[PDB]
Amino acid sequence: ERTRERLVYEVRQKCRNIEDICISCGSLNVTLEHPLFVGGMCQNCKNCFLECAYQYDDDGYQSYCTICCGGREVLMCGNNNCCRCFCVECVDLLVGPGAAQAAIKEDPWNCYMCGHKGTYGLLRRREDWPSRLQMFFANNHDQEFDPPKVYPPVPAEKRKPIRVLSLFDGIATGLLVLKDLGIQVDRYIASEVCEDSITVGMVRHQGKIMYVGDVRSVTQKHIQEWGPFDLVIGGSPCNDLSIVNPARKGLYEGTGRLFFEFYRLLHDARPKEGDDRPFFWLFENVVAMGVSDKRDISRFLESNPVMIDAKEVSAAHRARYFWGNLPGMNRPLASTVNDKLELQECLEHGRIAKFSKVRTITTRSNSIKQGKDQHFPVFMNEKEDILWCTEMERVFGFPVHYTDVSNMSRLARQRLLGRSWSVPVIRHLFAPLKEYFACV
Amino acid sequence: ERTRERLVYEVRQKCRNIEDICISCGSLNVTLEHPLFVGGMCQNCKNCFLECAYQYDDDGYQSYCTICCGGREVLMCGNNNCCRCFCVECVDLLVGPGAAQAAIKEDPWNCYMCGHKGTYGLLRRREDWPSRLQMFFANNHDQEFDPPKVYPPVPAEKRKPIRVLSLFDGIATGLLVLKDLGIQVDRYIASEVCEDSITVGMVRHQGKIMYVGDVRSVTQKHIQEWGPFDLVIGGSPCNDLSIVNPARKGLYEGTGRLFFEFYRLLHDARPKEGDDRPFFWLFENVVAMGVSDKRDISRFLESNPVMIDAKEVSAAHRARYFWGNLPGMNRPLASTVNDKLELQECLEHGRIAKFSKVRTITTRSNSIKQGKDQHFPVFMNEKEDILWCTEMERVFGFPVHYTDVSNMSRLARQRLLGRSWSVPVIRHLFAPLKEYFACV
Amino acid sequence: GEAVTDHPDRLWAWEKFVYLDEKQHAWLPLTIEIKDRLQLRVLLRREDVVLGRPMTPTQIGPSLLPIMWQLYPDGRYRSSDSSFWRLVYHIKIDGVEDMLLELLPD
Amino acid sequence: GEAVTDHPDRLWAWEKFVYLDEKQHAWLPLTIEIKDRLQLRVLLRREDVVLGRPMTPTQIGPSLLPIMWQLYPDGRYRSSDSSFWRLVYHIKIDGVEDMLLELLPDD
Amino acid sequence: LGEAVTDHPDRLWAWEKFVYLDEKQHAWLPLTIEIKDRLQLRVLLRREDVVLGRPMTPTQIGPSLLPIMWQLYPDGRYRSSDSSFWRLVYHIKIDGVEDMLLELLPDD
Amino acid sequence: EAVTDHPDRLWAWEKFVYLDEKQHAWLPLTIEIKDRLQLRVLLRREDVVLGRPMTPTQIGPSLLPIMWQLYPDGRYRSSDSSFWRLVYHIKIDGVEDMLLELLPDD
Ligand SMILES: [Zn+2]
Ligand SMILES: [Zn+2]
Ligand SMILES: [Zn+2]
Ligand SMILES: [Zn+2]
Ligand SMILES: [Zn+2]
Ligand SMILES: [Zn+2]
């Protein structure tokens, strides 16, 4: 245990440079540079940082310390939209003795990521730390994978409609986006077991979606009978109860049995050797996951993920991994005049916001409440209030009044909207498809 | 009772004509002809028929016998959209001995108003009975008052915006209709004490409505400080707490102390002698009220009502009295292509109706359960279902999603829509105003 | 004497100097006392008279008394001219029932 | 009780419930008694009080009293509203002068 | 003879050719395969703790009779990535070595 | 009883069914793995009814090679050019058994 303190004492004595030790856990094996501060990072802590760099509590505040991704007793930043966390040990060892007491005393406290000053004892912040953090998620385990195929564009005359297959459909965001872009659709087969979502889709899309129920019953004969497909897309919100519990997973369980069915059905639906017709696919999962699961998924699909965050073209914090082979999905994410990048443009008439981006939401309305004191995120007549459903719909990019059907209680709408994908992100990925399939 | 039997027996013996006895109660003092059947009618029965010809209980079926407007035990008609009543005594005397028992046996049974035949023993149905029933509601008691003054058309050049004062406003249907027509509005002062409707108006009309709280606090000085008005419109719903409990309404009570406030404020706002600017007003009440109250209201306002039913231009049964002096409000009620006159045009995709008009919807939740056995008026996947709010909104003529504001429980939405006025009727009434005030 | 515990809810002007409450009983103003410009008192007594014809407010014509009273809460009667009146006493005398109303300043 | 032949020739309304005789002396009507629809009598009293600002007919407003009174032969008075009134009596007691006028039926 | 085993594995993902890792990253190996008839096939799995090498992609594992990914479907049956079904015959522990047997099922 | 009758050419008429140049069927019964690399397969001679022929596509992926051919020094060359070593070929109770083993590549 004394190793870390000894190393800190030695550096303060000017015997070693701070770029040659692993500040997080205090080991002399340095292999990487810390993406935020100035120092070294060891192999063991790289995996833990990848895992825990994007995990947040039910209250919206961070779960694990920033430096060591661990912690036992913690402080917390005060500035809203900067809900990061620091633990006692790091503050005392690195910044200086007793600084934690002063940080606790001051009200409101600004952590070291807000302050205009860039140095605090040994803790020194970098200049391009946002870009550094973004690039840090490009350290995949294997790289031998070759570039994907590039099917030559088909001339406009020979183009023909698209046939789709969706797994764990949700409320049919894919069909909505495909209609928005202007691409003809010939089939759209969906699997789903949620009654509210089924009703919403049935009412909204004029019975164009064919439902086939549970996914654990689809056979290869069904796949061969339902005709050739040209796009297979799957992923969350995993409506079918294939993963047992939202919380009992921990960090490891559920992903395997979610990915098994997608791999099986994709294997069944893929063109056989000798056929050169275009074929595309897509798979999605959260950032907070084990390293072994990510390695295995990348091995079996033979590709590496591309992390996309929705806060660049919307007003929410939502980060995910996207496996696929769509044309040129690695290009930079850019906004358009049609987006609403602030929470002040999503509220109704006569209401005032308190943040810039909505932090987090869960199944229960208590999630929308903010702070350990449970204060609400909106101001109205100098009295705090929670977001309405018509405001969440704008936040997520859906058309307004999209989910008003079938006399659902106003609590189920919140879940339906929270579990769904983000429209502006999916449009980004689907945009290139116009070069291969006809248009209205 | 024996008297009625004796005269019935005598008419059977061809000693008297059936047009020389009051079939309802048997008195020989005949003064009018029965609007529906062939026979005579006396004064007391005329008053009772005016009172009780439009009262329907919770299930939607008639409350009192068709003939004698009284009765102890009643049968029920079977054909939907003809929920009428016939008491045993009347059926047994006027149709024949034992007829009511025979009708009891049959299942289902069509009453004498549906039947293709026009005679059943003595009870014979008049062929022009719809028009006759419509005309029977123009036997206004006592005086016939003078014609109202016609205000000369103002040339288009001098027209100026309108200034409105509303009492017991509701969800601001008047402003909605005035916007629809295309007439400029300068003021719209509203009095109201219900929070939900206040929120709906505030959100929907962008803070154009000035709220001034309850009505029992308004003084004459306020009516002067708030400037001259050019339209004073009042009536139900009784949002304020001057009634509160229908337990003390009966047929004569509860409705006598809203006219007090309306008359007081109208008297305060009326232009003084010598000021010949245009001035208008309008007052509304239900059909089922006491005769003395109607006489008094007509005396004090010095006009007779005009009964207008929304079933001619919409898909609901709603009959009201309208006092006022607007130009030409007695002209015939016509429809337009923009209306939806049947319940099959108001349902969402994939649903099938069971009637042609919504029997009776009021604040009470069970009012949607129309028909005997408390039917649910919609078929979906061969199952019974109730109307959604997005279907009631179309039924009442409102724009879709009008009342979707502020996380209201759907029961509150149902009540709000039930209490409100009907848009097409109000548009009919307000249409002539375009000749007097500017237009957008 | 004999105090009366309940009061009429309304007084509608049927004819000149005749008023009918909510139960169609006729009360007549027998005497009016005039202390000063802002003080007026009216004595109402209950008599069972043969009513004639009803009249419109135009035919009743100008009069010191209002055309309609209403029992506001707290036992105060508000007239159609927006003023306020106060109930002094309400008694019974061998079947004769009497009421008194006194104006209040604005 | 003194029987008084003093007889005001013309009474003009300076303010509501305030009347001035040709001698500018104020008369105050105190009470109105109603026995029949055509039997309305009003008691007038002579007083010496400070007169206020004059009131126009509009300010006076509707009132059961007429605005003008004028003497008529046979101990009668002609009112502004064309009605005729009778002088029931006029007496003086304890330095207080009381006069009672009653309405006559129309014909 | 052998002691029965009750804690069944949940997965068997191909790590190398002829090495399979369950949900706890323990290595099982197929030691013998029995061929009764054209539609009846049996595989014997045994657990050996060995030093593992670099992992292989499916395109490098190459064609093989065995599937690439088993999984424990409810009610105690193992589905493969080819949509077939397998049945657990026995699961026993002998002298510290644990053995598993899987039997294919006809096509219906 | 050792038998020196080594088959010359074995062709796959159906999956798990191989026909020698004498049209006699041989059925591979078991496949055994040593450690992690070496592969051994047992072939047995039998007289059974042959079914409809199966193309290479119908056979599908299989650890067995599709063709076998005799090679000097008691070796067989498989379809993928790999070499297999004979272990023994004996006859017991009128039933002939042959065991083949995969040699390491070099
Ligand atoms: Zn470390
Ligand atoms: Zn820490
Ligand atoms: Zn901070
Ligand atoms: Zn009668
Ligand atoms: Zn009857
Ligand atoms: Zn009927």
- Both A379 and A241 in one domain: the answer is yes
Sign, CA dihedral A80-A86-A87-A91, equals: negative
Q: Which residues contact B290 (CB under 8 A, 6 or more apart)?
A: B51, B251, B252
Please report which ligand is nearest the Cα atom of A67.
2
Subunits with 3+ Cβ pairs within 8 Å of E are: A, F
CA F40 to chain centre: 10
Q: Which two tokens stand for residue E72?
A: 């424990």
CA pair distance E82, A301, nearest whole angstrom: 16
Q: What is the dihedral of CA A363, A369, A372, A378, to 10 degrees?
A: 160
CA pair distance B202, A38, nearest whole angstrom: 54
Q: How far is A416 from chain B (nearest CA, A)?
A: 16
- Both A439 and A362 in one domain: the answer is yes
State the pairing for strand pair D10-15/D18-21.
antiparallel
Q: Which two tokens stand for residue A176?
A: 């909505």
Of A203, A206, A185, whose CA–CA distance to A195 is shortest? A203
**CATH 2.40.15.10 corresponds to the domain E1-108:** yes
CA F80 to chain centre: 14
What distance in angstroms lies between residue B361's CA and the mean position of ligand 5's atoms? 26
Q: Which one of A81, A96, A128 terminates a domain?
A: A128
- Both A162 and A280 in one domain: the answer is yes
CA pair distance B183, B434, nearest whole angstrom: 7
Contact across the interface for E29 and F33, Cβ inside 8 Å: yes
- Both A89 and A62 in one domain: the answer is yes
Cβ atoms of B317 and B359 closer than 8 Å = yes
Q: Which two tokens stand for residue A65?
A: 């310390």
Q: Which two tokens stand for residue B136?
A: 């029977």
**Which pairs from A275-278 meet CB under 8 Å and 24+ separation?**
A276/A151, A277/A228, A277/A230, A278/A151, A278/A154, A278/A230, A278/A436
Distances (CA, A) of B194 to A282, B191, B201, B362: 51, 10, 11, 18
Query: Is C70 touching B (CB cutoff 8 A)?
Result: yes
CA pair distance A217, A236, nearest whole angstrom: 19
Instruction: Please name the amino acid found at residue A47.
Output: N
- Both A123 and A167 in one domain: the answer is no
**CATH 3.20.20.140 corresponds to the domain C1-106:** no
Classify residue A170 as left (phi > 0), alpha (psi -120 to 50) or beta.
Answer: left
CA pair distance E32, E43, nearest whole angstrom: 6
Q: What is the DSSP string of F51-97?
A: -S---HHHH-S-SS-SEEEEETTTEEEETTS-EEEEEEEEEETTEEE
Query: Is D64 touching C (CB cutoff 8 A)?
Result: yes
Contact across the interface for B264 and C80, Cβ inside 8 Å: yes
Query: Is F80 touching E (CB cutoff 8 A)?
Result: no
Contact across the interface for C82 and B220, Cβ inside 8 Å: yes
What string of H, E and C letters represents the secondary structure of B138-206?
HCCCCCCCCCCCCCCCCCHHHCCCEEEEECCCCCCHHHHHHHHHCECEEEEEECCCCHHHHHHHHHHCC
List residues forming the annotated binding site of B for S-adenosyl-L-methionine: 169-173, 192, 214-216, 419-421
Q: Which one of A128, A151, A182 terminates a domain?
A: A128
- 4-63 in chain D: CB under 8 A from chain C: 15-17, 29-34, 37, 61-63
- Both A149 and A12 in one domain: the answer is no
- Both B265 and B216 in one domain: the answer is yes
D78: β partners: D70, D84
Contact across the interface for C82 and B264, Cβ inside 8 Å: yes
Resolution in A: 3.4
State the pairing for strand pair B119-120/D84-93.
unpaired
CA pair distance A326, A149, nearest whole angstrom: 10
Burial class (CB in 10 A: 0-12, 13-18, 19+), B420: buried
Query: Is B389 touching A (CB cutoff 8 A)?
Result: yes
Q: Is the peptide bond before B108 cis (omega within 30 degrees of 0)?
A: yes
Mutate to test the interface with C, among B295, B297, B299 (most CBs of C within 10 A): B299
CA pair distance B255, B287, nearest whole angstrom: 12
Largest CA distance in chain E: 41
Domain with B271 in it: what CATH number? Answer: 3.40.50.150
Task: Report yes or no on A134 lying in a domain.
Answer: no
- Both B246 and B348 in one domain: the answer is yes
CA pair distance B93, B123, nearest whole angstrom: 9
Backbone angles phi, psi at B426, to 5 degrees: -65, -35
Cβ atoms of B231 and B174 closer than 8 Å = no
Contact across the interface for E71 and A302, Cβ inside 8 Å: no
Largest CA distance in chain B: 75
Please give the residue of chain B at the shortest CA–CA distance from A350.
B203
First to last CA, chain E: 35
A255-269 helix and A291-301 helix, angle to the nearest 10 degrees: 0
CA pair distance B46, B291, nearest whole angstrom: 11
Q: How far is E73 from chain A (nearest CA, A)?
A: 9
The matching CATH number, chosen from 2.60.40.420, 2.40.15.10, 2.60.120.260, 3.10.20.810, for D1-107 is 2.40.15.10
Q: Which one of A128, A160, A177 terminates a domain?
A: A128
First to last CA, chain D: 35
Of A173, A278, A297, A167, whose CA–CA distance to A222 is shortest? A167
Experimental technique used to determine this entry = cryo-EM
Of F51, F83, F87, whose CA–CA distance to F68 is shortest? F83
Task: Scan for tokens 């067989």, then name that residue.
Answer: F76
Query: Which secondary structure element, helix H or strand E, spans residue A55, and what is its range?
Result: none
- Both A87 and A209 in one domain: the answer is no
- Cβ-nearest to B203 among A207, A349, A410: A349
Contact across the interface for E32 and F28, Cβ inside 8 Å: no
Query: Which secondary structure element, helix H or strand E, spans residue C2, and what is its range?
Result: none
Please give the residue of chain E at the shortest CA–CA distance from A145.
E57
Task: Report yes or no on B121 lying in a domain.
Answer: yes
Task: Report yes or no on A370 lying in a domain.
Answer: yes
Task: Enumerate the domain spans of chain F.
Answer: 1-106
State the pairing for strand pair E69-73/D84-93.
unpaired
CA pair distance F33, E16, nearest whole angstrom: 14
What distance in angstroms lies between residue A80's CA and the mean position of ligand 3's atoms? 8
| Residues of the domain holding A100 | 2-128
- Cβ-nearest to A220 among E57, E79, E83: E83
Contact across the interface for D31 and C34, Cβ inside 8 Å: yes
Distances (CA, A) of B249 to A403, B246, B252, B253, B257: 41, 5, 7, 4, 11
CA E58 to chain centre: 17
- Please count the other Cβ atoms lying within 10 Å of the Cβ belonging to residue A58: 11
Q: In this structure, what DSSP letter does residue A62 have? A: B
Q: How far is E94 from chain A (nearest CA, A)?
A: 30
- Both A305 and A435 in one domain: the answer is yes
Residue A255 among known ligand-binding residues:
no
- Both B226 and B77 in one domain: the answer is no
Q: Is the peptide bond before A237 cis (omega within 30 degrees of 0)?
A: yes
Cβ atoms of F11 and F26 closer than 8 Å = no
Q: Which two tokens stand for residue B189?
A: 């002062």
Q: What is the DSSP string of B369-429?
A: S-TTTT--SEESSSSEEPPPHHHHHHHTTPPTTTT--SS--HHHHHHHHHHS--HHHHHHH
